[PDB]
Design a protein around this ligand. Structure first.
Ligand SMILES: Nc1nc2c(ncn2[C@@H]2O[C@H](COP(=O)(O)OP(=O)(O)NP(=O)(O)O)[C@@H](O)[C@H]2O)c(=O)[nH]1
Ligand SMILES: [Mg+2]
Lengths: 168, 458
């Protein structure tokens, strides 16, 4: 049981770091922009057997987009990432969402606010309202502190499998 | 071998994707006209796999636009510089694919919009809008034909500078309503049309200024909120939310004789996605009215309030919203998680927005429910009681907010040892919020302090 998951969001929001953390458990301190896309399978053990997410970690930098949109073909779910320490990354969220729905019909999409470990958040909870507008699931997240780091995948898994009782 | 490389775009091997990407970029540089004509042919052939058709469509679309306004301007120029006959070829194949894709979001629609944004402002595809309008209204048009072009129409309106397409807004709006109207048999078509309207709301600003047309748009939207299909209802409710945000000042004539009952009904729906929007409608009204209040807060001055006319819809619906919201705080399953974004969670957020929006009138409306269920044997109601209490601690002046000390506190402390973990966590949440408000009601030196101290351990 596997699903194509496309990870999108502005450059530097921590998409790659987030994936590596789940992959190796290591925290990437450097910022090395992703070129086009990097595909990594993530396996989660659940009370209903292992579930595999083929994560298409896309580039947030306009110049390194590669196929960009083309990576969404046959995606079955997605995670939209923005940086809680950067207001502009939350502002671009609607654009990432639009790109996703113009290619993917009715896939489960989770919105993630990353870097909540950082002292002062530039994008505070009260300002985050896009999920209410489009009925999306939202999560404060931190690839560094692992705060809620499995939540996005748990919600998607429950959504794809059709079992609200699925546990990791 | 173009189809072969387009087929590789879905492969997980970076080596395959890079090879495909390098091949596509080169072909574009080598001979853009032939590349786009061939890509459009792959797109048009219903014999091609979905991967091949979508990939071809996105290649074409990404040659005509960019998130970068300068790159986009250059791409649009690059296209316009292409041999007009070749472009006619791409345009023909693209339009001809509308209605031939067996998958829902179609890729030809994006191409149509990409080319439209470049050619319309220079007036070069005069046959576009008329053809699309006819595709929607033709009685013999298939459902796929209708969906495809409605998507395209919406994308065009969402993407071109308004100014360049106003000369045909009325004709565009007419097609969109036709696709939205009750008599339309397909829910997929109604959905595509309702989505097209939503993507086109900002583009229809001019039309919203025409009373007659404004009435017709609200007409079809409200009706769509009554469509049996859940997806159409949700999309229609989303239109009302967006309309309230973009056209707040025209809502008087519709609020009361229509919007109120529709949104109230949606909030009570057992279909979660529907209740969510019914709730968002009012949470959104609070956000808009809170602005009209920060705007109006201009005893700094420069004339009268800009164009502010907060009609305080929230204040007026408060008596009806609360009992619905507090009841919604009761909808929690044994498998629901504290932070799932569901009606229960949305109601809490809406309550708090009403709390700061109508800083006082809430207390009187919420207290009854708190007192009736703060000890209810059912944890859902018990939890709802505690949560509601905490949703009114932000707004009401601490003076009135002292009904936490006397009665609340003792029980709020006990509830933290409740058999139910949900109840416990919410109790803690509420108690924590009380610590933030206490200093506001500083009343009692060396008593406000020790309390905070003891409380802190909890
Ligand atoms: N403090 C903090 N830093 C984080 C967190 N997650 C990511 N970072 C940092 O943010 C920077 C960028 O992360 P990266 O994974 O490269 O982001 P990206 O979203 O993949 N960028 P791109 O789209 O260009 O490929 C790195 O310095 C990384 O260590 C987090 O939760 N907290
Ligand atoms: Mg990176």
């Amino acid at each position: 049981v596997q699903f194509k998951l496309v990870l999108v969001g502005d450059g530097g929001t921590g998409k790659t770091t987030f994936v590596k953390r789940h992959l190796t458990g290591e925290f990437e301190k450097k910022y090395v922009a992703t070129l086009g896309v990097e595909v990594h399978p993530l396996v989660f053990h659940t009370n209903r057997g292992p579930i595999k997410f083929n994560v298409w970690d896309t580039a947030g930098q306009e110049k390194f987009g590669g196929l960009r949109d083309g990576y969404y073909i046959q995606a079955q779910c997605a995670i939209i990432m923005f940086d809680v320490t950067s207001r502009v990354t939350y502002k671009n969220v609607p654009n990432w969402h639009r790109d996703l729905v113009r290619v993917c019909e009715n896939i489960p999409i989770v919105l993630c606010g990353n870097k909540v470990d950082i002292k002062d958040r530039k994008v505070k909870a009260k300002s985050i309202v896009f999920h209410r507008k489009k009925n999306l699931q939202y999560y404060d997240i931190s690839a560094k502190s692992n705060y809620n780091f499995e939540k996005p995948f748990l919600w998607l898994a429950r959504k794809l499998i059709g079992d609200p009782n699925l546990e990791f | 071998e173009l189809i072969t490389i387009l087929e590789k775009t879905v492969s997980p091997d970076r080596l395959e994707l890079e090879a495909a990407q390098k091949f596509l970029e080169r072909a574009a540089v080598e001979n853009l006209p032939t590349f786009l004509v061939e890509l459009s042919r792959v797109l048009a052939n219903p014999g091609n796999s979905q991967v091949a058709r979508v990939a071809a469509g996105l290649q074409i679309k990404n040659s005509l636009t960019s998130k970068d306004p300068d790159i986009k301007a250059q791409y649009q120029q690059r296209w316009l510089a292409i041999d007009a006959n070749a472009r006619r070829e791409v345009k023909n194949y693209v339009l001809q694919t509308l209605g031939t894709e067996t998958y829902r979001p179609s890729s030809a629609s994006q191409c149509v919009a990409g080319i439209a944004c470049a050619e319309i402002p220079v007036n070069q595809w005069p046959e576009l809008i008329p053809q699309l309008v006819a595709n929607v209204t033709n009685p013999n048009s298939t459902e796929h034909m209708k969906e495809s072009t409605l998507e395209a129409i919406g994308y065009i309106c969402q993407d071109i500078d308004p100014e360049q397409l106003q000369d045909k807004s009325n004709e565009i709006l007419t097609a969109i309503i036709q696709g939205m109207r009750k008599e339309e048999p397909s829910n997929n078509v109604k959905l595509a049309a309702t989505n097209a309207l939503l993507n086109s709301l900002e583009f229809t600003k001019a039309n919203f200024d025409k009373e007659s047309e404004r009435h017709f748009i609200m007409q079809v939207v409200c009706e769509a909120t009554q469509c049996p299909d859940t997806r159409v209802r949700v999309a229609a409710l989303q239109n009302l939310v967006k309309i309230m945000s973009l056209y707040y000042q025209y809502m008087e004539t519709y609020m009361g004789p229509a919007l109120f009952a529709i949104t109230i009904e949606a909030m009570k729906s057992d279909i979660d996605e529907v209740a969510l929007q019914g709730i968002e409608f009012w949470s959104n009204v609070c956000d808009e009215e809170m602005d009209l209040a920060i705007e109006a807060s201009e005893a700094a001055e420069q004339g009268r309030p800009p164009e502010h006319t907060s009609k305080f819809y929230a204040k007026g619906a408060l008596q009806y919203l609360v009992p619905i919201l507090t009841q919604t705080l009761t909808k929690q399953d044994e498998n629901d998680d504290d932070d799932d974004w569901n009606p229960c969670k949305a109601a809490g957020v809406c309550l708090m927005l009403l709390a700061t929006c109508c800083e006082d009138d809430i207390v009187p409306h919420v207290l009854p429910f708190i007192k009736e269920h703060i000890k209810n044997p059912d944890w859902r109601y018990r939890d709802a009681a505690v949560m509601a209490f905490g949703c009114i601690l932000e707004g009401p002046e601490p003076s009135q907010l002292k009904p936490l000390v006397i009665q609340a506190m003792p029980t709020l402390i006990e509830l933290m040892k409740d058999p139910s973990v949900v109840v416990r966590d919410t109790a803690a949440w509420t108690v924590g919020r009380i610590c933030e408000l206490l200093p506001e009601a500083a009343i009692n030196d060396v008593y406000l302090a020790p309390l905070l101290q003891c409380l802190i351990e909890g």
